[PDB]
Write a protein that binds this ligand. Structure first.
Ligand code: HEM
Ligand code: HEM
Ligand SMILES: Cc1cc(N)nc(CCCCCc2cc(C)cc(N)n2)c1
Ligand SMILES: Cc1cc(N)nc(CCCCCc2cc(C)cc(N)n2)c1
Ligand SMILES: C[C@H](O)[C@H](O)[C@H]1CNc2nc(N)[nH]c(=O)c2N1
Ligand SMILES: C[C@H](O)[C@H](O)[C@H]1CNc2nc(N)[nH]c(=O)c2N1
Ligand SMILES: [Zn+2]
Lengths: 404, 404
């Protein structure tokens, strides 16, 4: 039942015993592996057992398991659930749950950081207006003038008798995508839909490719409300190249803070539909995906041409050459602007360190090989060469449907 | 929708369902609780049922399903299995099954070519000297002075009681790896075991980085005999750069013919333990894995130093830049030399065509994403964004225990 897992560079071998504590099925069966799929196809007595489970996790972690407080806390949960069908987490438990859900995130290469997360309790929130205020303090704290600090902010749990608090935007900072006459897109094509919903709910659009979108925030069973982030909070890094001086001409820029805003956080059976969290970028996310995917800004040809590369033929590897300059430019420009970033070499090295830690601490580490291995130079990094077991542990960030 | 895996391309936004997976008659390593698809590695009546299925496939492939010939061939196999425990394939059943195994191989990006495979029958082979003759013929035909041609040679199947035919070497062509007294390896480290095996059976070793191993060939129930390949039969390419002149002085080379000799070819339950097969390289096999893996030639640092790159910090992207140029050097030199090769861009483009043909032809295609995605410039190729379903179909190429 316990997989042999091998590193092929170093010949080293471990066994995952941690997977045994997974109790949510993934999409694979013995007939066919489905691990490369981005999304899944996708309660009285049972919320109860996830709660015991989780409270157990919490008291084991402060090394006070089977102590008195443990018992009296299990009794709280029971009594609360028996009468109301639900319960509430103490602030310190939430803090524990939030860090554990990062820890369990199998798609995340930055997990070495997991124990260092600033947790904002925003459960005493009753309006879109307040969410905005909480969302602003988060951006301000996490951004920290370029010296970035991981942070999550947690809005009120989902409740049986009403709508969810939701942030409609997929990220706290997004560039407008304007769907043009000839069906081309000025700006980020990833953000066409959200851009149109913002216009639909009253927003005045610009005509740049890097227009910072407003936030569409929704309090339960209310029309979402629109807030313009103040430009002074959203820090942005102009893109240039250490030697290629025309690179600066291309007006390229990315924003400092990668803050995911549409995922749901699950802890001990409670669900937190709005709980944005942020760290700092690994440079390939910007330099390779956001700028080079052909269904994003798709700037590879432009760059290659400016680099005077023979475009005609795949075999001159013009794609590979320009991709590498753009990634260098993202690192260069971030290090200049003194904004926190990490390259895929440093990041995957530190990730290797994390597997070793997690092997000593828990007996394994859930890991999604296709998301961990970077999008350029995969086998140049040590994770390419490391087998990994993937599986769902709770607490967990999960995808959730879009509100509209 | 339908309950078959839904499969999405994130670049194009297109959806398909894989119905082919229902044909899978074998379990991979995944289960609902944990994905294991990144792991490199995993007669009685069971023969009969395997045989009936292969034969049904053959007759559908020739559009004669249900015909008298079909049920008479069924009848035939059942009698032969019933009185000898095994059975033999007709010639063109062997050609079909061979092609079908390549067609079925989830790890092969080259399957647009699956239709064009020269199948040499060698089931008459009765000695290790003769194996050698067939391999030399195979190598000559396949290499065809640089204009390479895919081919497989099929030695006699396994039989109850009697020993297997086996090619000990993992590939027909392998460079020696000599273990130094100081702990390093000279040559190719992947081939240390097979080098030291060749010496034990009496080969006189050389001392270069690129010495061609002799073949260790095992006729049934005999110790393996040793055979040296005439140098004129082994086409090799010296590596040089179109613009960095010093690259040629590095003395690097690779062989033209990728020919796998250690796999088992399975058909209707019959097992061909020696059926080596060969195509042509994708440039990233040579330039990225074989030359740059840390556990292989590991020339990345030497090359970056020659390029005058900053090798003391990850963030100069020194690894990425050196890898690109080594890869350019691979293509350029094979091109200059009129030896067939394909780059990871063209190759993945055409595997996308192959997926689309197979969708129409059979309703899906088993594909191992981690192996289909090239090991440099992943997300720069269209397979990066294509979800894929991996499962096992027969005929199959399969791994087998080394015979020592
Ligand atoms: C501190 C710096 C961090 C870095 C460099 C990092 C790195 C990454 C990267 C490169 C990805 C792949 C994303 C993509 O391809 O778009 C990712 C995914 C993810 N990260 Fe992080 N991470 C960091 C911090 C965090 C934090 C603080 C959290 C939560 C508190 C987090 C949770 C996640 C989750 C849930 C995913 C999966 C995303 C999805 O499925 O859409 N990470 N991480
Ligand atoms: C025609 C040109 C071909 C190209 C460019 C090609 C390309 C590739 C590549 C890049 C790999 C992965 C190599 C690695 O990671 O080491 C591979 C694997 C494979 N190919 Fe091909 N292929 C070709 C022809 C063939 C032929 C003729 C056959 C057999 C009839 C074949 C069967 C396989 C199998 C079974 C694997 C997986 C081997 C393993 O799991 O170790 N391919 N192919
Ligand atoms: C299918 C899908 C759903 C979703 N919610 N999000 C995505 C991509 C989100 C990008 C996650 C980016 C990130 C997040 C964090 C916390 C750090 C960092 N460096 N990068 C894809
Ligand atoms: C553990 C292991 C076993 C095995 N049989 N093979 C491997 C890698 C073999 C490399 C396959 C190379 C190849 C084969 C063919 C036929 C064409 C082409 N371009 N490349 C690893
Ligand atoms: C289809 C495929 O699973 C998908 O493109 C994944 C591959 N790996 C990834 N890895 C990361 N980090 N981010 C991604 O968006 C993707 N995309
Ligand atoms: C651990 C991981 O599965 C392993 O390194 C695989 C990854 N993908 C690969 N892909 C190909 N084509 N060849 C390989 O040898 C590997 N190695
Ligand atoms: Zn799987």
């Amino acid at each position: 039942k316990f997989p042999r897992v091998k590193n092929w560079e170093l010949g080293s071998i471990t066994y995952d015993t941690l997977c045994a504590q997974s109790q949510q099925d993934g999409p694979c069966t013995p007939r066919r592996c489905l691990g490369s799929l981005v999304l899944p196809r996708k309660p009285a007595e049972q919320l109860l057992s996830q709660a015991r489970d989780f409270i157990n996790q919490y008291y084991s972690s402060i090394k006070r398991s089977g102590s008195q407080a443990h018992e009296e806390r299990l009794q709280e949960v029971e009594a609360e659930v028996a009468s109301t069908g639900t319960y509430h987490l103490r602030e310190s438990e939430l803090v524990f749950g939030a860090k554990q859900a990062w820890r369990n995130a199998p798609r995340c290469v930055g997990r070495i950081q997991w124990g260092k997360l600033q947790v904002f309790d925003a459960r005493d929130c009753s309006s879109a207006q307040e969410m905005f205020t909480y969302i602003c303090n988060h951006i301000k704290y996490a951004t920290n003038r370029g010296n970035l600090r991981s942070a999550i902010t947690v809005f009120p749990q989902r409740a049986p008798g009403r709508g969810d608090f939701r942030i409609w935007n997929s990220q706290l900072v997004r560039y407008a995508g304007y769907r043009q006459q000839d069906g081309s897109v000025r700006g980020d094509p990833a953000n066409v839909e959200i851009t149109e919903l913002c216009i639909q709910h009253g927003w005045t659009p610009g005509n740049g490719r890097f227009d910072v979108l407003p936030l569409l925030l929704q309090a339960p069973d209310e029309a979402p409300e629109l807030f313009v982030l103040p430009p002074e909070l959203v820090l942005e890094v102009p893109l240039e190249h250490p030697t290629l001086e025309w690179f600066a001409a291309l007006g390229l820029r990315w924003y400092a803070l990668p803050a995911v805003s549409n995922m749901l956080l699950e802890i001990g059976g409670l669900e937190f539909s709005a709980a944005p969290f942020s760290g700092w970028y690994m440079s390939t996310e910007i330099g390779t995906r956001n700028l080079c995917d052909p269904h994003r800004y798709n700037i590879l040809e432009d760059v290659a041409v400016c680099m005077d590369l023979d475009t005609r033929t795949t075999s001159s590897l013009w794609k590979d050459k320009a991709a590498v300059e753009i990634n260098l430019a993202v690192l260069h420009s971030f290090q200049l602007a003194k904004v926190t970033i990490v390259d895929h070499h440093a990041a995957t090295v530190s990730f290797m360190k994390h597997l070793d830690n997690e092997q000593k601490a828990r007996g394994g580490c859930p890991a999604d090989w296709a998301w961990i291995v970077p999008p350029i130079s995969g086998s140049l990094t040590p994770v390419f060469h490391q087998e990994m077991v993937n599986y769902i542990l709770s607490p967990a960030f999960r995808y959730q449907p879009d509100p509209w």
